[PDB]
């Protein structure tokens, strides 16, 4: 079966970390739908001029408006973004892919699960953090390198060194927004992909989340960093047409 795949980066990404996947993804018939968020890959907009997540999630909701249900795959903060989409567009889902994500819940903040990464103490290395009237961060090579993309193809750590450009948690945000919706969010059919060589979400980390708020299905990528749709693209596309199959 075929579905309409909306692929959403996370912060600091762009569209760009999904080119592999995409024509993997259509050669299997399936419809994809790649954004950039706001002030993320080639938009205009500076994340300087980005005052709150609903303004960084913008393409993201637009684009779910404008549907003429999809399956969403939110990868990494990216799960935050998917998860207010579904807020708002839940009969247009079919299912919420969280692919080594922040999953957040209906229970707590918004921003728990965020706060819970910060508890794992992760190690930024050479990311350079400043504020604007949020905090900022601009992610370091060598914490890119050895942290997010040691078991992808050297060319795709390049394309990240290109094309990573400054981004936000909106941590203050999440945490005084209006908690995600029963009806909303907490309707939709979930899926997390989980992979078991992150070294920046720790796979301790995302069972957590697991646990925390149990998924309708649950996949390991056995030797996913935290780029599986680079560093695993062909076993991605499998995972992600059962997903299909299950779910259309
Ligand atoms: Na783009």
């Not at 290109?162 to 979930?190: C, H, V, W």
Request: include cysteine.
């Amino acid at each position: 079966a075929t579905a309409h795949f909306v692929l959403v980066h996370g912060a600091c990404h762009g569209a760009w970390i999904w080119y592999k996947l995409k024509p993997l993804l259509e050669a299997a018939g399936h419809k994809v739908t790649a954004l950039d968020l706001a002030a993320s890959g080639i938009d205009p907009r500076q994340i300087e001029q980005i005052n709150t997540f609903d303004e960084y999630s913008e393409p993201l909701l637009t684009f779910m408006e404008s549907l003429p249900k999809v399956i969403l795959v939110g990868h990494s903060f990216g799960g935050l973004n998917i998860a207010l989409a579904a807020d708002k567009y839940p009969e247009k889902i079919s299912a919420a892919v969280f692919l080594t994500a922040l999953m957040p819940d209906t229970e707590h903040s918004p921003s728990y699960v965020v706060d819970k990464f910060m508890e794992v103490f992760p190690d930024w290395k050479d990311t350079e953090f400043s504020t604007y009237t949020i905090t900022g961060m601009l992610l370091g090579f060598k914490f890119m390198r050895e942290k997010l993309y040691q078991n992808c193809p050297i060319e795709d750590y390049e394309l990240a060194k290109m094309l990573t450009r400054p981004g936000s948690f909106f941590i203050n945000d999440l945490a005084q927004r209006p908690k995600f919706t029963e009806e909303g969010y907490g309707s939709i059919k979930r899926v997390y992909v989980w992979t078991d060589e992150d070294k920046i979400f720790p796979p301790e980390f995302q069972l957590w989340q697991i646990e925390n708020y149990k998924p309708d299905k649950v996949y390991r990528v056995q030797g996913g960093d935290h780029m599986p749709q680079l560093s695993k693209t062909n076993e991605l596309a499998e995972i992600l047409q059962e997903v299909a199959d299950t779910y259309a």
